[PDB]
Structures are given as C-alpha cells and as structure tokens.
Amino acid sequence: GLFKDRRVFDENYIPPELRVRRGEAEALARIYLNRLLSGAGLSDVNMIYGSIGRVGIGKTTLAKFTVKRVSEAAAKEGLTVKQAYVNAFNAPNLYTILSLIVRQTGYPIQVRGAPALDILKALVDNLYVENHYLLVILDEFQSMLSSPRIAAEDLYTLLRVHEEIPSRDGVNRIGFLLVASDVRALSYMREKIPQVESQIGFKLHLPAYKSRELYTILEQRAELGLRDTVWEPRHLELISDVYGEDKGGDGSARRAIVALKMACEMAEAMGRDSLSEDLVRKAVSENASIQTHELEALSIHELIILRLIAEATLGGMEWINAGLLRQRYEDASLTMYNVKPRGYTQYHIYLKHLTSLGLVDAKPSTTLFRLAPHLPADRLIEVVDNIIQAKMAS
Ligand SMILES: Nc1ncnc2c1ncn2[C@@H]1O[C@H](COP(=O)(O)OP(=O)(O)NP(=O)(O)O)[C@@H](O)[C@H]1O
Numbered sequence: 108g109l110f111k112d113r114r115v116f117d118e119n120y121i122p123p124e125l126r127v128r129r130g131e132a133e134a135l136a137r138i139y140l141n142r143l144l145s146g147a148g149l150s151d152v153n154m155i156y157g158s159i160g161r162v163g164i165g166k167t168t169l170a171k172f173t174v175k176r177v178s179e180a181a182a183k184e185g186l187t188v189k190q191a192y193v194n195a196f197n198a199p200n201l202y203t204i205l206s207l208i209v210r211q212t213g214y215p216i217q218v219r220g221a222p223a224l225d226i227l228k229a230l231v232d233n234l235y236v237e238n239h240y241l242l243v244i245l246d247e248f249q250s251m252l253s254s255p256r257i258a259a260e261d262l263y264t265l266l267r268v269h270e271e272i273p274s275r276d277g278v279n280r281i282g283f284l285l286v287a288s289d290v291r292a293l294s295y296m297r298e299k300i301p302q303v304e305s306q307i308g309f310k311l312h313l314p315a316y317k318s319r320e321l322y323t324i325l326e327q328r329a330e331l332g333l334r335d336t337v338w339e340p341r342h343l344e345l346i347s348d349v350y351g352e353d354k355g356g357d358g359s360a361r362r363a364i365v366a367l368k369m370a371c372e373m374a375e376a377m378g379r380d381s382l383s384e385d386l387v388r389k390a391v392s393e394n395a396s397i398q399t400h401e402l403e404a405l406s407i408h409e410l411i412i413l414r415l416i417a418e419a420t421l422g423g424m425e426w427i428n429a430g431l432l433r434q435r436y437e438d439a440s441l442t443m444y445n446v447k448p449r450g451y452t453q454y455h456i457y458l459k460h461l462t463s464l465g466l467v468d469a470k471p472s473t474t475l476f477r478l479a480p481h482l483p484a485d486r487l488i489e490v491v492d493n494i495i496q497a498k499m500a501s
C-alpha cells in the first residue's frame with residue numbers, strides 16, 4: 108500500500124545515516140578511532156545519557172549507529188571491530204552480561220560454570236587469537252549501578268579490563284560505550300565508585316528534540332520507508348509542530364515516528380493510497396510516558412507538592428509563586444491528607460528535588476514553579492493521588 112518498507116518504522120531500525128546528532132556520532136566515533144588507528148588498540152570508555160525523564164531521544168540509536176561507524180571506518184584500514192549490544196535491564200549479574208557478550212561475538216567460549224572474570228579472560232584471549240577488537244555497548248547502564256547482584260569491584264574490573272587482564276601481546280582490544288537514562292547514573296558513580304567514573308573520557312548529553320529536528324527525522328523515515336507519492340512535507344510538519352520540545356511537546360522521536368506509522372496504516376485501512384492531513388492529525392491525537400516507579404520513589408510530601416503544582420497548571424494558571432504554593436501546601440497536607448505540614452527547611456529540599464527530577468521548572472521573578480509542560484497534568488494528579496494513598500496505608 109503506502110509503505111515501500113515497513114521495517115523502517117520498527118523500534119530497532121537504525122537508519123543508514125544520521126541527519127540529526129550526526130556530529131555527536133562523529134565525535135564519539137573519533138575518540139575510539141583515534142586510539143585504534145594510531146596502533147594503541149581499543150580501550151576507551153564513553154557514556155551517552157539523556158535528559159531526565161525524557162524518552163525516545165536517540166540514546167540507543169546514537170550508540171548503535173556510532174559503533175557501526177567505528178566498525179566501517181576501521182575496516183577501511185583492514186582492522187576488524189566486532190560490536191556487542193547488551194541491555195542491562197535484561198541481565199541481573201555480570202555473569203549474565205558477559206555470556207550475552209560472548210553469544211554476540213560468536214566465539215566458542217564455554218560459559219557453563221565460568222566466573223565473570225574467567226569469561227572476560229577467554230574473551231581477551233579469543234580477541235587476541237583472532238586479531239579482532241570488541242566495542243561493547245552497555246545500555247540501561249544505570250540498572251547495572253542499582254543492582255546488589257553486581258558488585259562495585261566487578262564493574263571496576265570490567266571497565267578497567269586491560270589493567271586487570273592484560274593480553275598476551277599487550278594490545279588492548281575492548282572498549283565501552285555506556286548508555287544511561289540520565290545524569291543520576293553519573294552522580295551515583297561519582298559518589299559511590301569514583302575510580303570507575305574517572306575512566307569515562309567523554310560524556311554526551313542528549314536533549315529532547317526540537318520540531319525542526321523531528322521534521323528532519325520524519326523526512327528521512329518517509330524517504331526510506333514510504334512510497335514517494337504518499338506524503339507531503341506538511342503532513343510531517345503536523346507531527347513535528349506538536350511533538351517538538353520547543354513547542355511544548357515531549358521532543359520524542361519514537362512518538363513522532365509512531366504517529367507517522369499510524370497515519371499511514373489509517374490511510375491503508377480506509378483504502379486511501381496517500382496521506383491526508385486529517386489522518387495525520389488523527390494519528391497525533393490517538394498517539395506519553397509517566398514512569399510510576401519514579402513517583403513511587405518519592406515521599407508523600409514531595410507527592411503532595413507535585414500534585415499542587417500540577418493542579419495550578421490544569422486550571423490555566425501556569426506558574427505559581429513560592430508564597431501561594433507554601434500556603435496551599437500547608438492547607439492541603441492537613442485537610443486533604445491528614446498529615447502535619449513539614450517545616451520550611453525540609454520543604455525547600457523537596458521543591459529542589461522535584462526540580463532536579465525535571466518534574467517542575469523553577470524561575471525567579473519570589474520563585475515561580477510550574478509542571479513540566481510535556482507532562483499530562485490530569486494523568487499525573489491521578490497517579491500521584493493513588494501513590495499517596497498507598498504510602499499512607501503502609
Ligand atoms: N537522530 C536520529 N535520527 C534518526 N532516528 C532517530 C534519531 N533519534 C532517535 N531516532 C529514532 O527514534 C526512536 C526512539 O529512539 P531511541 O534511540 O530508542 O531513543 P531512547 O532515548 O533510547 N528511548 P528510551 O530508552 O525509551 O528513553 C527510534 O526509532 C530511533 O531510531
């Protein structure tokens with residue numbers, strides 16, 4: 108029907124080129140290549156993280172595209188770099204991370220009963236036998252940090268492998284690209300394991316996408332994925348104008364792409380063979396992440412303040428001043444929640460924390476606060492209320 112290749116719209120499709128974040132991909136690729144193309148092997152550890160609470164902003168895509176580029180460029184010089192991708196949500200312990208990494212190399216290394224260290228040794232040996240290099244992406248890295256099943260000392264040996272496990276010929280052949288959801292992963296590493304954190308040479312922060320970038324991203328999906336007659340620029344603008352973070356949206360490329368997908372299948376299902384504006388607009392309106400586990404981690408008192416900031420937004424008065432907020436907070440704790448209001452000192456810590464979680468923006472002129480514009484205010488009020496109820500009962 109409308110599609111010339113539907114797989115261009117699947118969640119792990121990686122485009123043959125990047126048109127947004129291209130420079131960041133080159134910079135990352137170059138740090139690896141600089142070490143490798145100068146005969147110093149592969150050993151760098153770098154990280155990609157995103158804005159706090161933002162999803163679908165290219166963390167995974169950038170990391171995989173970059174490694175892909177390192178591999179193409181190294182082959183022009185005849186080198187051989189293998190790629191291994193591990194999502195650390197999908198792996199409780201280092202033993203599991205490691206056996207996933209060997210599965211991907213294809214090397215015949217027996218992992219039954221082998222300690223994490225020993226698997227790493229066999230890996231180092233096979234890379235030496237073969238004359239190969241291995242660039243490892245560890246995605247959702249933050250889950251490797253909040254995991255009692257993985258010990259500080261282990262991450263240490265993993266991320267400092269060439270100091271702990273030297274190769275036969277002294278050629279370092281393993282580098283790392285860590286991908287974490289946000290800066291807290293770094294904050295945590297600094298406070299808990301600064302000897303591993305210090306190994307990270309380059310940290311790259313991915314922000315949410317502006318409308319212009321989303322437009323560029325949708326245009327590349329249309330070109331590769333849609334038949335040329337099916338779409339028009341304006342169709343795509345309709346998506347990017349709403350989702351752009353400069354326009355009050357998510358800035359999520361995942362959401363934008365899924366909208367365009369949906370609009371196309373909505374056309375097919377009707378018997379149309381091109382898009383129309385109605386279908387695109389339709390798609391945008393049936394097509395937003397609120398992570399309850401983040402809220403559940405918050406104390407009742409933060410949750411009460413979050414709620415109040417949210418309702419001030421829902422009633423068309425976006426931006427509430429410190430004074431009124433405090434008043435409503437004292438008012439609200441006692442009457443609505445039957446808890447005594449916390450003192451000023453504790454209160455300010457709570458407001459700060461909400462801000463640092465990106466849930467609320469704060470601006471002076473005496474402080475003004477608002478819900479993050481991209482947050483659905485009534486969905487959040489709902490979620491928040493139930494969490495307060497559950498914490499109290501407990
Ligand atoms: N610069 C880009 N160029 C082309 N496609 C992109 C870009 N950034 C994101 N995408 C696409 O947008 C979708 C979401 O990207 P993804 O790399 O999975 O974001 P993410 O930050 O890892 N999402 P999440 O882990 O859920 O917070 C995927 O289909 C990507 O291929």
Ligand SMILES: [Mg+2]
Nearest residue numbers: 166167168246
């Ligand atoms: Mg991801």
